[model samples]
Target: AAIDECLKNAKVPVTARNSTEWKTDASPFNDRLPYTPAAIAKPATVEHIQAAVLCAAEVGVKANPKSGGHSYASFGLGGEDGHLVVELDRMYNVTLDPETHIATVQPGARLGHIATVLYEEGKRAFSHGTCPGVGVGGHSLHGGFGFSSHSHGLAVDWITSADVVLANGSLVTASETENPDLFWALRGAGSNFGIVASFRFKTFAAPPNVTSYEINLPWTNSSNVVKGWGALQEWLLNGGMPEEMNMRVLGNAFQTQLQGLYHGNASALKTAIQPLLALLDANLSSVQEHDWMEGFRHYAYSGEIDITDPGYDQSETFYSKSLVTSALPPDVLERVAEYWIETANKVRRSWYIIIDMYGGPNSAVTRVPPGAGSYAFRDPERHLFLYELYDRSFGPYPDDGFAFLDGWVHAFTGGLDSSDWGMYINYADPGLDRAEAQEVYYRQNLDRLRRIKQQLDPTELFYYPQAVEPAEV
Candidate 1:
């Protein structure tokens, strides 16, 4: 086949397969039938990716680029046959410029690799998602948020430049000074453009130690929980949150764990969390003043429980839905509590919601205009929360569980001020429809992204199922 020929010509490894067998079905949020690709090419370098793209273009075959294979809706991955998979997992590379406080990493690089190297460099960067197994390409392109998003901005904000491979097999590096329009669009609307080969990001000096607090409050006492938390979040935004403090709340069936980090004075953390601890039961567990490296080590693999250990790579189905809410009203919080309780009772697998409080010196990120890059959410001073559900152990009622969770997320966001409804790109729900995605992810920034896409790929050859589609003029 032409795919094999292209691989032979470029010395790329090509695998031809049919049906769901080609991919691990567990990667997607839902158990939709997997797409079959004409051939999967694992290119080891930027040149390899360029050659693959050119070959596909010449042969009139659609090629999908995949970095970490974590597209919630199978966007970068293809549909049925007639698609070529350009795998970039082998392109991992990280170059740090301590002088500039920046890092240039390849698309295939994982957070673990970058974090370890940065730690060694006496520096650090921001990232979202639960583990280090996530690929930087997808997260940054989509909008990366995490524990540090409260203090720092989304991952895309850290991006300084990107080397993108366009639809015509041409390579372009987008930055503030060059291809600015495309640069703006790519930061937030990357999938709408093309495959990124490498991205240069602005890094920051991370604290040597981060104090993590995990305090659980009784779910039975849900009356003032929402209102009190909202008030505390408002306090952080107004008076300025300590750069050393980053907090999140994880709500479950009968309890809520306030997990977070503080960069300094471990001795003072307990005193700082006293206000929150006052509301919780005495039986609550807590560990303060842990080494930063040790904390990150545990964080990479799910807080001491290494579920993603390579040796134990068994299949587990995970269904997660997320929302970016401005701030929760007292009544909305009560509704959310009820919804959480009801969903926990219905679902057989693990389910929880995590909330991150944002605003600080790092909060200056919102000042940037919307067209700066593909990342469009700009309310840095406002309080935001990310609600998600994970079901590792597959059950017969997965759809029912997801439906319930999705509906609650819809209601939760529906109560938010319409203009402030922002969806973090990294936490985007896989079930989000194309129209909804444009509105939630792009909002007013969609038309500019479409213009950039058209300018870069007029034929729309780089299209993915979940990518932003050009809007009608």
Candidate 2:
């Protein structure tokens, strides 16, 4: 009843139900899980964030932060209607230190903005996702991966510390020396602990003249391409491929394309990829070199993700899922490809898949021990992401949508136990419940995460439909 009075006393600006901005602020990037937040609090400072959280507590509502508002599940909007959202759009800031090369980034800062700032200011950069519009907070905190990831490491690995606002409205620094346990939890299970106001990252020198390439193989040569894919996997799994390469096979119902960024010159790129190239002939191939920002624009082509602004001008109605596991054997790879073609024919909507190489010889990601952070899938060879885009005319996401995806994943994971495989939390799936999700996302880290949740956020103030829970006392 005293929402206005308390909010006014704390000086936190909000877009509530009565405001003309309510509808716009509440819209999600992925319309599949739309939520009408009770109010969207735009706090511009850490003190204001504390005040907003306190106000939410006083008003008897759960508070969540929205950085870039890019959560596919819209968990940043509290995952369902009527939750309080601490929108961080106004807090975007990126600062880099000249002496130490450490960068301080606000949670609301986007990937492209950070990439541009860090490189332009000091020739510094860090591992993060490709989508320029995705916020640094969610991406870094929950397994951030990009074209540079295979070389530098996951975004969480670079985080030296974070300024987190606790459930009790206390702003504490989570780092190696201060609140270290909370710091450990923040790396992977960050959202469940507190809202991160700021992150200080250990930045790296930006690479020069990054080369980008696209190699297309005709559908008629799919068999040889599959053989080539298998050979590439073998070379990678056996160890010692150049870490400078971060490549993926992007595929749709009828097409398969290999495109990626090489953090080195063109000659070295070919020398490294020559083994795989020997197996097949590419009908179409293109390679070009660019500076840091230009390379970024090249990657974020088509404006699916924006680097210059944090506006919601583009949106996709999509259902996506991910899996982390060892390489699929040569025989299994063919079977999966066959199944993919089978499923593609049955689906009436636009869809695609990304076969991401996560682990290989000297991978920065795998070099980090499993116990270093809460990100549990450091040992996987590949991450397969299956996505299907639906248009408004589709009416409802059909039952076959889930069936085809699940059936496709099972084509690869049919015989494996849950322990042998994992899912990426960055590609959030709301269908899994608490226990299933914990096992899939956290794996061996669940016991520690739960215990930490019990100690720091026992009241469950920072929570969502699929957030981790505190252990029973």
Candidate 3:
């Protein structure tokens, strides 16, 4: 079969579907969309990665690399099934230069591992998401955000260059100066073009002081909760909150809390949060200080777990949607809040929503020039993640689930124009088709991304269902 032929020329160990490794290598992070990979190529070296890609090309098969395999839709498993997967778990490596503060990372490196090494080696760090189990490859390639992101910037903003293997089987380094077009495309839409073997990032000095704080609001008084929520959003949009303060509004059936991480002195942290604290339950609020490494620990699985591990590796069945829009005025928040509470009481299934602050219009995330990187949601006021969880995710999702979540999203963004709101590329929704994903995720950048795809991966050798469709030259 073609897979055996690929294995022969791959020069690396390729696990077949019939073997024991198949189960481990083929399993995805999200069980709701599990897939069967034709073959999983475990490369020991960057050279082996190139060989596997080339071999798959020669055998007429599609290929995709699994960095941390944490994609919500399992795009790492070819987003559908029966594609050659280059599992990068063994390639996990993170090394930093002492003097220059530039880090050379492998695609397989997990986020927690990278954060620890960078801080321990040289007291340096970069911006990324809160989850420790996520891999640097997919996180940075798309747009990485973390507690410190408002103070720093997205992870892609820190990247200097990437050594990637194109679908043509040629290895080239894309940076601001060389292969510039491909470089521009890789930062925002890296998964579409090739397999990244090495990434060069310009890291920053690890903040010495990190304070995590939380203000728990009682769900008993819906009016007070809505007032506190609206007040926080108003404060953020007005730019009254300092850039050092990172915030999130978390809620569900069990709890409704306003929590965040700070990168300044204790007095300043309290001063910045006092205005919002005035409206909520300050007695139940919490403030804990930690050093750089421990700060990573404080943010555990965002619950309490050893981040050093690859990831929760836990499987769950859930349908989710995301929205990026301008600041929600008080009226909108009041209406949405009431509807959210009403729906929560009505639904029997478990669900939650997390609203991440982007530090307003003046934060570092917003200062990046338009042509800086292909990351699309740079200017949004906040990112709302809506998740609907089920009792079991081993099989296909509930058919009614789609409408429920879609209605939730519409409730929040229904009044905005199409241009005012967009979807987060990293929080991919399996419900979207190719045209919808490209349109929602890329917007203005899609045409340019398509042209670049035409140049580098014309035949669509590297593709998933929602991958950008190449256009005519």
Candidate 4:
């Protein structure tokens, strides 16, 4: 294969290995399901990736870039046979520049590594997602949201620049300045471009320690729990949320976890959460005053334990489906919680609803031109809530599980009339059509994105099975 020739030419520290040894029935599914690649290209440096891209362009072979290899669909790996799978697992590198408050990260660098490194440097970037295993590329390219989103903003906001190898095998920098058109698209619609070599982001000074306050409410009925929580949400909104405060609410069968992260002093957190305490009649458990690093550790540990527990028996692979809601009205909130509990009981794998408050400097995202970056539906006043219906079971059940989960979520949030019902591009599913996708995700920006795609990728050489194709010129 030309990919092999390309690997030899780059002389990368990593090698290209045949998949004959590691092939399994589990390999056919994408991250959502097990999937296998015809062959895997392990590249350790930007030079190696550039070589791979050049080889693919020469041979007219299709290629997909993979970081953690956790994309829900085949976009990261599984497409047609004979296509090159450029895996960046060996490219993990993270360097922090305290002077510039920026971190130049390799695509393969995972959140845990970045978090730990920043912790030691006494600085941090806006990074949040439940799982630490996710690669920086997948998250940053797709507008990653976390507990800190309400404060520091989405992961893309911190991105200052990127080194990208375009479809034609040209190496260029995409950012606010050079190749600004591609830079704009790279912020959110990154997949539409070719392979990304590295990401440079602006970092921030973090507190010596952080405080995480988690409230476990003992309520089995989803309706009541959501109702009470909604009232509390109203209170916080009324007073205006502090930049240091970020809260996420998730509900499941017979229980609801209200997790809060305070980047300020513990006393200030106590005062901020006082309003929430007034909503609940009683608390089941509370963990507080831990060190900031300890707090991150706790967050990481809790998520790992949740996913690795023996209850799953390895029969289920984690499947994530996301929906971004502009607003969560009282009734909508109640139904959402109810649907979550009901789905969990039926699916038998853990399901979670992630609500992130987004606003602040990042909220001005709408000010950026549409083609500059493809993040659609920028509403600074609304809190963005993404509901992830996670299913653990494998095989024939996934299709059915996805269908049921989608139906329930759609029906529950259908009446809310959100400005956009689109899923984040990083989280796009093959099941959604462009029109339907635009209606839900792009809202007013569809025309702009299509036009931009036309100008940059006039030949449409980069179009994929699920990417946003430019309208016919």
Candidate 5:
């Protein structure tokens, strides 16, 4: 009755479980983690969001706010049964302030939409993730990283302000000055605090062109490849590498591929990476030049697919685990290869490992110290790289497949140095327990996040499986 009354008065459109929209909207990116919400409210405006939130509060049911509906664990569908899901797909909008270079983006705005709008309107850009379908709300709130992260910073670092609706349905602005603590919490762990209606980001001037390169090597030469790659990456991190250089390694038992983006001409990029390529004796090497947005497409989608298209290899069931490490060890690489081979033979599923580079003097991310914001993994001196372990499979035996993949990741990370056994919170894993999750995701900053959680949401309204729990008063 309360929910009905609130919806009636607020005029928010809601679809029940019986409706087709509800069936589609409630489903997450990973079909293995399906969730059914009691109701899905598609708010077309900020007022509708306020009303929907109030309705949920009034009805004494938890409200889960979803922007892109991309949560791996389907937390966007409340991560549990009998919850109201506030789907913000209808709120997609991006506007730029040409004078200040500020972009006011709605939560539902996808990365591709924002990128296109900024470039077409003002030739501006911001550091963001590679996936085009990823929502700005969840991405920026959880410290987005991408091709330009070395030079610019995480997307969260560029946010200047946010319009958030609190648990009590009151709207407020959070930034460096106003509601500073809330602003701090919003950067990394904002999902557990409030519903963000929109975000204001500080945009940067887009580089004219970017040079991309790819190198492929067979795993038969794993030892040498790993050694040479590790040595070169270490040397690069020691301040010799150009800020424009962003590199990554995608590997499996059969092969190793090195991909990179250099924010300059092809000749300079080729010159920069020539020695490393020579060391690997890469079986395949290629370089190409692209305009700013074109380079981003190439980086995110291999320049072969359109971002506007719905089917782009992202909509599939998969299990993923991530870890932040200082550097790759030869033993770890060997172990990964061994396990990859075993998993492939046993389960016949597709699996791969992605290693992303981090840290540089010019990176605004390194400048921000830990404890300054909710994004506590800002130890530029220690943390240097991130590893993502992924297993892709259909629904026949997802449990067995995920368990095998999970154990492999655990064993692999356990063998490495414990000094930096952190995990990326955005690539969250449901397998982690609360205490372990807090430790890996926030490290020493968990207590502070808890206090803020308590202050903003005493009743623990905003929550998910691994959400930060408010400290007991």
Candidate 6:
């Protein structure tokens, strides 16, 4: 009755399972874990979001807001049955302010859409996730990163403000000058606070061109190669990497690939990476050049195509875990290589490792000191890289197969020193318990986040399995 009354007063659309719209509206990107919410509300405006939140509260039902529906664990559905999902796909809109260079984005806007619109309209850009289909709401809330991260910073860093609907169905704006504490928490631990209806992001001028390179080198008896790569990374870290250069190393069962993008001409990029290129003697090396928008296509692994291509919106079932470490020991690298080889030979699933380089002088990430925002892990000095283990299978893997993969990853990471362990909240691994997950994601910021949660959502209205808990008062 409350749901009906609220919907009637707010004048918004609501879909129940019995309705024809339920199947299409409530479906999540990761369909592996199917979640059927009690009802779905496709909010077309901020008023609609406020109405939905109020309805859920009035009806005493859980409310979960979903943007692009890319939460690997499907936490967008509240990770359980009988919840009201505020599906924001109908609210997609991106508006740019030319003078202020600010981009106001709706919760439902995807990264690809924003990027193209910004570039085409004003030649402005901002850091975001590599996946095109990821929603601006979740990605920015959980500290978004991409090829431009090394140069600019995480997406949260660029956010100027956000329009959010709090637990009591009140609409408010959070930013540096207004409700600063809420703004701080929203940058990282946002889901716990409220549903962001829209975000205002500061955009930077797009670079004219970028130099991209991909190199694949065999891992067979490549102890020296691993050692050399580590040494080069250390050298690059200390000697200063150009602000324009962003590099990543991907490891698989067969070989390791070094990929890089330089926000400049090819000649400089060649010189910048010559040391590693010469040392690795990559069997396969290729370089391409692209302008600002084209470079984004390359970064997202989507070639020049129509924006609405299915490839850009594709999804898959996968399991992944990640850790941030100061440096990768040669032994660890060797062990990972061996594990990859074994997994390829013995396991039926596909897996790989991604090493994302973080922190540099010109990096907007490094500019923000640790503890300044809800993002507590911004260690510019020693925060070297993020190592991610992504395991994927087309169909469901047997329970034993899942167990084996989990054990392998845990064992490998367990041996590392505790100081080397940190987790990215965006990845949202389902294996971690609440305490451990909070420890890894928020770290020292947990107490503050807990306090904020208590102040704003003492009843734990906005919650997921890994959401920050209200402080025990």
lDDT of all the models against the reference? Answer: 0.65, 0.77, 0.77, 0.63, 0.77, 0.77
Report the C-alpha lDDT of model 4 over 295-392, residue by residue, as the tens digit: 66766643442121111111225555667665567676667666655655455655555555444233333334444566764554453455555555
Tens-digit per-residue lDDT, 1-473, candidate 6: 56656776778777755876677666666656668786788787888889889888888888889887788778888877777788887776888998999998988887888898899889999988787778787888988878888888898988999999998899889988999999999988888899999999999999999888887756555465466566656755674567788877787665678777788888888787776666555533678889987788886865432232222345677777777766567777666545555554356677777877776454556678775589866876556776667778788744555564566566447657766667887877877888899888887789999999999888777877888989998
lDDT of 4: 0.63
lDDT of 5 at 262: 87
Cα error of candidate 1 at position 246, Å: 1.2
User: Which candidate, 4 or 5, has the higher TM-score?
Assistant: 5
Per residue, candidate 2 scores C-alpha lDDT tens digits across 306-419 of 354534444567777677767666666776767665555447777777777678765788878767888887763443221222222135566556666676667767756676
Cα error, candidate 1, residue 416 (Å):
3.3
For each predicted model, how many residue pairs clash, with residues at least 3 apart or on different chains? Answer: 7, 0, 1, 15, 0, 0
Candidate number with the higher lDDT (1 or 2): 2
TM-score quality measure for candidate 5: 0.92
What global local distance difference test value does model 1 have? 0.65
RMSD vs true structure, all candidates: 3.7, 2.6, 2.8, 4.5, 2.7, 2.5
With a 3 Å backbone cut-off (N, CA, C), the pairs that clash in candidate 3 are 128-145
Global CA lDDT of candidate 2, please? 0.77
Query: Candidate 5 regions off by >4 Å?
Result: 1-5, 278-284, 302-314, 328-334, 340-347, 360-364, 395-397, 416-419
Task: Provide the lowest-lDDT 10-residue window in model 1.
Answer: 305-314
Q: Where does model 3 exceed 4 Å of error?
A: 218-226, 279-284, 302-312, 329-331, 380-397
lDDT per residue for candidate 3 within 1-473, as digits (tens), equals: 78667677656877767876777678877778889877888887888888888877888889999988888889999998788899887777888988789999988887887887888889999987777778788889988777877788888998999999999779999999999998989988999999999999999898898988887877645577577766666767777667788777677767877678888767778887777666554642578888977777877655532243433365667777776677665666666667677765456666677777764764777767778777776663543221222223245667776776676677766766677667776777878888989888877899999999998999898889889899887
